[PDB]
Ligand binder design. Structure first.
Ligand SMILES: O=c1ccn([C@@H]2O[C@H](CO)[C@@H](O)[C@H](F)[C@H]2O)c(=O)[nH]1
Ligand SMILES: O=c1ccn([C@@H]2O[C@H](CO)[C@@H](O)[C@H](F)[C@H]2O)c(=O)[nH]1
Lengths: 810, 810
C-alpha cells in the first residue's frame, strides 16, 4: 500500500500464508472453525518469529568467530512495548504480512492490538534502554541487554470515581512468543552468609542460593540482518531448598519473589530489601555470564579490551564491587590490578539530580545481605579518600563530602559516589544536565578527575517513533527525499527546501488531520469519550510528578474556563487538553493531582456555555502502545518542568519528530531542541536555571504571586471553596496548602509567562499555513535526536568501538 | 529391527529427519554445533507431537458431530510416567523414528532417558487412572481425564546414610512439550463466603475467587487414530487480587498454592485445609466444563444420557453436592429432580478398606470453606436417613452407623457414605475386595440398595506394560501368534500350545536373561552397584507401608543370611533381593523400614563368607520409568500383604505379564491370578482372610511365635542387640517393639509358611526348564488382567456405552 512498508512479492505472500496456516494447526492446535482473533495474532507472531531465527543464530555465530569487543548494557528496566510491528518493520515484512493476512480474510491492525506490552519499565529511563537496544543492533554493535524478567511489569491503571486504581500487569498470561527460555544456562546467585579469612584471602560462606534462569529475546537491527540478544533473568529455588514437607515446597516462593514484580517508583528511591536483592540478582548472574563468555574466546589484562559494561543509573552499581570480588577472591588477582581492570571496564550514566531519587543504602542492610561487598566498598572508600587527601591536603570538609560512606543517624552508602570512583566515564543525558553535574552535585569529583565527565544527549529510535507509529508522515517524507533518513535521521534537514512548497505544506497538514481523526475515533470506541477533531490537541503525557508540573497545566485550563465564563460570546481557539500518566502507588500528591484533573473535566466537560470550545480528558493507562497512538495526533507538546529538574526528557523528542510544536521551559533537552530548530520556532517561557537559583537565594514566597495576580487568586479560591468538589468541599486542601506554603517547584512563579505564551500558541493556530510551516521547521531539524547519533557517541567516546551500517548476509 | 515396532519406510524416515532438523532450528533455536542430547530429545518430542495434532483435532471434531455420551474420569492423581515412547508405540512410529535418529547419528534410547516422568500420583490409584486413559482411547470411548496440574509431583527420593531424603520434583523446569495451555477456557472457582436466603432460593455470596486455567494433554489410542484429552487445571489469582502494592502482588502466591504440590500420602488420610481446597478446585472447574459442553450440544432430564462421572476414590466426592448446588441454586431445578439426575450421573470406585485411609472431613473446615456445600450435605443426609428409617423401622443403631455425619469430639463428614448415597454404582477393584465391602464396611448400604454394588477387577495396559517395556518378549510372542493380542490380550491363551515347544522355552528364557543383563548394567552405570546376573532376581517394588509387609521380606533375607553363616559350605540358590519404594515424609515406621533394609545390605553385601550368593539392594527413587526397567528383569514377584488388606494390587499383574513367578498371599487380585493360571503355577502361602479373622477373635500374641520358632528368636535378638547397627545399638528398638507388641498386620503369623514357600521357589529355580514352563503358563493366562477388559466392563455395566475397536480415518 505505502512504499516504506516494503515489497509484497507473490513468492513471499504465498510462503507467509502457508506458514501462518501451519502454526495455527501444529503450534496452536486449532482449526479455522474455532479460532479467535487471539489465535490469529499468535499464528502471525510465530510466523514472523521464524524469520528472525536464522539471522539470530548467524549473528551470534559471527560474534563468536570475529570476537569483537562486547558491550553489556545493564538495566533494571527495559520498557519494550509491543514487538510484532517493530519486527516486521526491521525485517521489511510489513506489506507482505498485510497482504497475506488480507488474503486470509483478516485485518492485521486488529491482530496487532491483541499483543500485550512488555511493560518492564516505569518511564523515560526504561524506554531509553529500549531505544538504545534498537540503535545498537542497527549500528552493528556486538551488544547485549541484561535485566530481570518481571512476572508483573508496571501496573495497569484504571480510573474509578476519578481516582487511580492499580491492577496487576499479568502480561505473561497468554504466553510470550518472542522469548526463548534457556534453562540450560542457569547460574547460582548467593545471599546472606558470612566472611571467613583464610591463609589465602577471604571466603564468602554459609550463603543462601537462588538460581538465575535466562530467557533470551531477539533484537533486530533495521534491515541489516543483525539480531542481537536481550537476556532477562528469572529467579528459581534450588531443588533441595528448605529440604514439614508441604510447607518446604510452598516456601520456594520466598526465593522466586525476587523476579516477581517491578518496583513502580519513578525518580524516587525506596530503600526496601527486596529491591536490593533484585539489584544484586541481575548483577551477579550477568557478571558470571560475561566472564564465561570472555574465557571461552587466564589473563584479565585484556578484559577491558573485550568487555564494556554500561550502568544505566546506579541501580546496577553493585557490578563494581562484584567484579572486584570475583577478580580478587576467586581469580586471585592483586587488588591494584583488579581495580585497574574494573575502572577501565565500567561506565556510569546519571539520569537525575533530584535528591530523593538518589540511592543511599543503609549499611545494616548491606552488612546482612552482602557482607563481602560491604567490606570491598569500605576498602574502595579508604583508597579513594587517600587519593583525595593527597590531591587536596588539609581539606577535611571535602573528605566528608566525597566519602562513599554517609555518616549520620543511620550510616548509608552513596551509590552514585561508588559509581564515579569505579568508572572511567560518567555522563549526563543532555548538555544542561551534564553541566549541572559538574557545577553542583558532582563538583568535587569533577575537580579530582575532570577527564571522567562527559555529555551524551539522549535520543529516540526513528523506527518505533516515526515509521511504526506514523507511516503517513514517513511516506510523504520518503516521497521527497527517499528512504535513507530512517537510518540517518540528519537527512531530514533536506526538508527545509520544502518549507514554501504548497504541496508539501498541504500533505503535512493532511497527515496530522488523519492522525487526529483516527485517535478521536479510538477514544470513542475504547473509552466512550467524545472529542472535537478540529480543536487544537494539547497534550501532556509522562509520569505524574510534582517537578513535571501537571499542576501548572491545570492552572492554565482553569484560567481558560474562567475567561470563557466571563465572556461567553467571545471567540476562542477550541482546545482538547489531554493529560495522562501513572502515579506511583505510594505517592499521595501525585494521586491527588490525577483526581484534580478528572474533577476539572467533570465541571468543564458538562458546562453548556463552554460547548465544544474546551474539553479536558485524562488519558487512562499511559504506556508505550498508547504513546504510539497519541503522539502522532498531537498539535502541542507540553514540556513544562521547573528549569534544572528534568535531566533530558525523551517524550519531547517524540513529539518534535511527529509534527507537534513545543511549549516548554529551558530545561533538559528542550534547550538543544530550540537551538536546533531556532528559538523563533519554539514556544519558550519561564524562569531559566539562573532565575530559579536567584529566587531560592532570597526565598520563594508564593503568597506574593497570589496577592498580585487576580486571575490566580480566583483559581485558588475556587479550589479552596469546593467549586471542583461540591460534595467534598475540602477535598483539595492538601494541594492548596502545598502550592501556598511548601512548593519546591515554584508553580506560581511561572504562571503569568505560561499563560501569555499559551496565548501566542492560540494566535499561531488561527493561521493553519504558518502553523504548518513552523511544524516543517521542527521536523526538519529533529535529526540530532535520533538514538543512532547517541549510540555512535557512546561507541566512539566511551566504549572504544566503531559503529557499522554494513549488512550481514541474509 | 523388530516387527512389533512397525515399518521404517523411506518416505517416513526422510520426512521425520526433515521435521527433526526444522524443530532444532526454528523451535529450539539451536544449530548442530551447540546442541546437547537434551536439545535432541526436545527436537524428537516436537516431531512426534506434530503427528498427534491432526488426529487430536479430528477426534474432538468427531465427538462434536456425533455427540456420543461422554465419560468424565475425575482423579486427583494421574501417574503418567514418560510420554515419548508411548506415543511412538501407539502411532506405529517406533522403528521409523529409530531409523531417522540413527541416520542423524543419534541413539534414540539415549534420548528417551532425558524425559522427566510426569509423576502426578503416589502409586496404584494414580497409575490405574493412567492405564484407564490408555484403554479408553484404545476402545474408542469419548472419555476425558480431569485432574490438577501439580507444579511438583511425587518427591524425588535420595538415600543418604541409608535414610530417605526428599527433593522437590521440579518436572516442568525444562518445559513440557506434550501439554497445550488453554488460558482462553479459564473458569472461576469460589471459596469461603456465606449463604444468603432470598425469596427465590439460596445464594452463595462474599466469596474469594481463584481462577482455574486448563492445560490439555493428548492421549492416543493404540493404532486406531483416536486421540482423547486429559485436562489438568492450574490455579491462578485474579488480576484485582488483594488490589501495600508490592505485598498485594506477592500475596498472589496464596491462591496459586492450590496447584503447587501433590500430597505424598498413599493409603493415609491427612485432613489438611490445602488438600480440601485441591479437591474442591478440581471438582468445581470440571463440572462447569461438563455443563458448558452439555449445553453446547435447557432440559437436564437427558443429562445422565449424555454424561457419566466416575469418582476415583472419595477424593472428588464433592462432585455430588456441587452438582446439586448448580442444579438447584443456579439452574433452579427442584430438589427431587436434581437428585435423580445426580445419582444417575455419578459412580464411585473404592480402593481400600483400611480405616486410616478413609476421608472424614471435620465439619468446622467445611463450614468455613464451603458453607453452601455443608448445607446440601446435611439435607442429603436427612433425606437418606428417612429412607433407612422407612426400610428398617426402629433400628436406631443402623441410623447412627449409616449417617453421613459422624458424631463425637469433633463432628466429621464420612465422604464414602456421601459417595454411596449419591451414586448409582459402587465398585470394588477385585472380587475378594468387592465381597469384603458387602460383608463388612458397607454391609448396611448393601442391605438397603443391593443393586448398587458391583465388582470391576483392576487391570494394566499391555501397551506400556509389555510392548513398550519388554519388546523382546512382545516380539517372540508375535512370531508365534501374530500382533492382535496387543489389543486383545485374551489371545495369549494360544501360548499354552507352546509349553512343550523346546524352541519357545529357549526363547522365553533368553529374553529374561537379556533383560537381567541390561538391568544389571543399568545399576552399575547409574548407581555403581555390582550384582550377579545369574542369581534369582527377587523383587518387591511398591510404596513402603506396614500392611504390604516389606518387613516379612526382611525377616526372610536375615534367615537366609543366618543359614549361610551356620553352614557356609552348603550350596544355596544365589539370590539378588531388591526392594524399592517411597515412604510418605511423615510416616515414621516406613522411614525406619527403609533404614533397616539398607542396614541389612550393609552387613550382608560385605560378608566375604556370603560371597555373591546373596545380595540385598534398595532400589532408589522407584517410579514409573524405573518400574519399566526392573519388572521385565524380575524372576520372583513379592506380593505378600496380610490377607484382606491389599484391595487389588496392579504391580502383581505387571510382573505376571513379564515372565516372573509370584510368591503371595491370597489377597486382592492374587486370588484371581492364581485362579486363572492354576494354583500349582503360583507360590501361595499364609493365612487366608478367614484365618486372620479367627486370630483377631482370640487375640494376636506375637510372643507365642517368638517362643516357638528358634530362627525367628535369633533375628529379633540380632535386631535388639545392635547386630545391624553397631554404632547405634538401639536404632531399631521401635521396629522390635511394634513387631512384639503392636503389630496390626501379623508379620510373625505368616513367617514359618513364608520361609517354607521360599524354599520351594529355590527348588524350582534349580530346574531352568521347569521354571520356564511354569512362566509360560503364567504369561499365557494373564489376559484377564488387561485394562481393556476392565474398561469394557465399566462401559457396559456402569456407563451404559459400547466400546469400539474401529479406526477413525487417518
Ligand atoms: O528514576 C528515574 C530517573 C530519571 N528518569 C528519566 O531518565 C530519562 C532517560 O535519561 C530522562 O530523559 C529524564 F529526564 C529522566 O527524568 C527516569 O525515567 N526515572
Ligand atoms: O490411597 C490409596 C488407596 C488405595 N490404593 C491402591 O489402589 C490400587 C488401584 O485400585 C489398588 O490396586 C491397590 F490395592 C490399592 O492399595 C492406592 O494406591 N492409594
Amino acid at each position: 500500500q505505502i512504499s516504506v512498508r516494503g515489497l509484497a512479492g507473490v513468492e513471499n505472500v504465498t510462503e507467509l500464508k502457508k506458514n501462518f496456516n501451519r502454526h495455527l494447526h501444529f503450534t496452536l492446535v486449532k482449526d479455522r472453525n474455532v479460532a479467535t482473533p487471539r489465535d490469529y495474532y499468535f499464528a502471525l507472531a510465530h510466523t514472523v518469529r521464524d524469520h528472525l531465527v536464522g539471522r539470530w543464530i548467524r549473528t551470534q555465530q559471527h560474534y563468536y568467530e570475529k570476537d569483537p569487543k562486547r558491550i553489556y548494557y545493564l538495566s533494571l528496566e527495559f520498557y519494550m512495548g509491543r514487538t510484532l510491528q517493530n519486527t516486521m518493520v526491521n525485517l521489511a515484512l510489513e506489506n507482505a504480512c498485510d497482504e497475506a493476512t488480507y488474503q486470509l480474510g483478516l485485518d492485521m491492525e486488529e491482530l496487532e492490538e491483541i499483543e500485550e506490552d512488555a511493560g518492564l519499565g516505569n518511564g523515560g529511563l526504561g524506554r531509553l534502554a529500549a531505544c538504545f537496544l534498537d540503535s545498537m543492533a542497527t549500528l552493528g554493535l556486538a551488544a547485549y541487554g541484561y535485566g530481570i524478567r518481571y512476572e508483573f511489569g508496571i501496573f495497569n491503571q484504571k480510573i474509578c470515581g476519578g481516582w487511580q486504581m492499580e491492577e496487576a500487569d499479568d502480561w505473561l498470561r497468554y504466553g510470550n512468543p518472542w522469548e526463548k527460555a534457556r534453562p540450560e544456562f542457569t547460574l547460582p546467585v548467593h545471599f546472606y552468609g558470612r566472611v571467613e579469612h583464610t591463609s589465602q584471602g577471604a571466603k564468602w560462606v554459609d550463603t543462601q542460593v537462588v538460581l538465575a534462569m535466562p530467557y533470551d529475546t531477539p533484537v533486530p537491527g533495521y534491515r541489516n540482518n543483525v539480531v542481537n540478544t536481550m537476556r532477562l533473568w528469572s529467579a528459581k529455588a534450588p531443588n533441595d531448598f528448605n529440604l514439614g514437607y508441604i510447607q518446604a515446597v510452598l516456601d520456594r516462593n520466598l526465593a522466586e519473589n525476587i523476579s516477581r514484580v517491578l518496583y513502580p517508583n519513578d525518580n524516587f528511591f525506596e530503600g526496601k530489601e527486596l529491591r536490593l536483592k533484585q539489584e544484586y540478582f541481575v548483577v551477579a548472574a550477568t557478571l558470571q555470564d560475561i566472564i564465561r563468555r570472555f574465557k571461552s574466546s587466564t589473563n584479565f589484562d585484556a578484559f577491558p579490551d573485550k568487555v564494556a559494561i554500561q550502568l544505566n543509573d546506579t541501580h546496577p552499581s553493585l557490578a563494581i564491587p562484584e567484579l572486584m570480588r570475583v577478580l580478587v577472591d576467586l581469580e586471585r588477582l592483586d587488588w591494584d590490578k583488579a581495580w585497574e581492570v574494573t575502572v577501565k571496564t565500567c561506565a556510569y550514566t546519571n539520569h537525575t539530580v533530584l535528591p530523593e531519587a538518589l540511592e543511599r543504602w543503609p549499611v545494616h542492610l548491606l552488612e546482612t545481605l552482602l557482607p563481602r561487598h560491604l567490606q570491598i566498598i569500605y576498602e574502595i572508600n579508604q583508597r579513594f579518600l587517600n587519593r583525595v587527601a593527597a590531591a587536596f591536603p588539609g581539606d577535611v570538609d571535602r573528605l566528608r563530602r566525597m566519602s562513599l560512606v554517609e555518616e549520620g543517624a543511620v550510616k548509608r552508602i552513596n551509590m552514585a559516589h561508588l559509581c564515579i570512583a569505579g568508572s572511567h566515564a560518567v555522563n549526563g543525558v543532555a548538555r544542561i544536565h551534564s553541566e549541572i553535574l559538574k557545577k553542583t552535585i558532582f563538583k568535587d569529583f569533577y575537580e579530582l578527575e575532570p577527564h571522567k565527565f562527559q555529555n551524551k544527549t539522549n535520543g529516540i529510535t526513528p523506527r518505533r517513533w516515526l515509521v511504526l507509529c506514523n507511516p503517513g508522515l514517513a511516506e510523504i517524507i520518503a516521497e521527497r527525499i527517499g528512504e535513507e533518513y530512517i537510518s540517518d535521521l540528519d537527512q531530514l534537514r533536506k526538508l527545509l527546501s520544502y518549507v514554501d512548497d504548497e504541496a508539501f505544506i498541504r500533505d503535512v497538514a493532511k497527515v496530522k488531520q488523519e492522525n487526529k481523526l483516527k485517535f478521536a475515533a479510538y477514544l470513542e470506541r475504547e473509552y466512550k469519550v467524545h472529542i472535537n477533531p478540529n480543536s487544537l490537541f494539547d497534550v501532556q503525557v509522562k509520569r505524574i510528578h510534582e517537578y513535571k508540573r501537571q499542576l501548572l497545566n491545570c492552572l492554565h485550563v482553569i484560567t481558560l474556563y474562567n475567561r470563557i465564563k466571563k465572556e461567553p460570546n467571545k471567540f476562542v481557539v477550541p482546545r482538547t487538553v489531554m493529560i495522562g500518566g501513572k502515579a506511583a502507588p505510594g505517592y499521595h500528591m501525585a494521586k491527588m493531582i490525577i483526581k484534580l484533573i478528572t474533577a476539572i473535566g467533570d465541571v468543564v466537560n458538562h458546562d453548556p456555555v463552554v460547548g465544544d470550545r474546551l474539553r479536558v480528558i485524562f488519558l487512562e493507562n499511559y504506556r508505550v502502545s498508547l504513546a504510539e497512538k497519541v503522539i502522532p495526533a498531537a498539535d502541542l507538546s507540553e514540556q513544562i518542568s521547573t528549569a534544572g529538574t528534568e535531566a533530558s526528557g525523551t517524550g519531547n523528542m517524540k513529539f518534535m519528530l511527529n509534527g507537534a510544536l513545543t511549549i516548554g521551559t529551558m530545561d533538559g533537552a528542550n534547550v538543544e531542541m530550540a537551538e536546533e530548530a531556532g528559538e523563533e520556532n519554539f514556544f519558550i517561557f519561564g524562569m531559566r536555571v539562573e532565575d530559579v537559583d536567584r529566587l531560592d537565594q532570597r526565598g520563594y514566597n508564593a503568597q506574593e504571586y497570589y496577592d498580585r495576580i487576580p486571575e490566580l487568586r480566583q483559581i485558588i479560591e475556587q479550589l479552596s471553596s469546593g467549586f471542583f468538589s461540591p460534595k467534598q468541599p475540602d477535598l483539595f486542601k492538601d494541594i492548596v496548602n502545598m502550592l501556598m506554603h511548601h512548593d519546591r517547584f515554584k508553580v506560581f512563579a511561572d504562571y503569568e509567562e505560561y499563560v501569555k505564551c499559551q496565548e501566542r500558541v492560540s494566535a499561531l493556530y488561527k493561521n493553519p499555513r504558518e502553523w504548518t510551516r513552523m511544524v516543517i521547521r521542527n521536523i526538519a531539524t529533529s535529526g540530532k535526536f535520533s538514538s543512532d547519533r547517541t549510540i555512535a557517541q557512546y561507541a566512539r567516546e566511551i566504549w572504544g568501538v566503531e559503529p557499522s551500517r554494513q549488512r550481514l548476509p541474509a
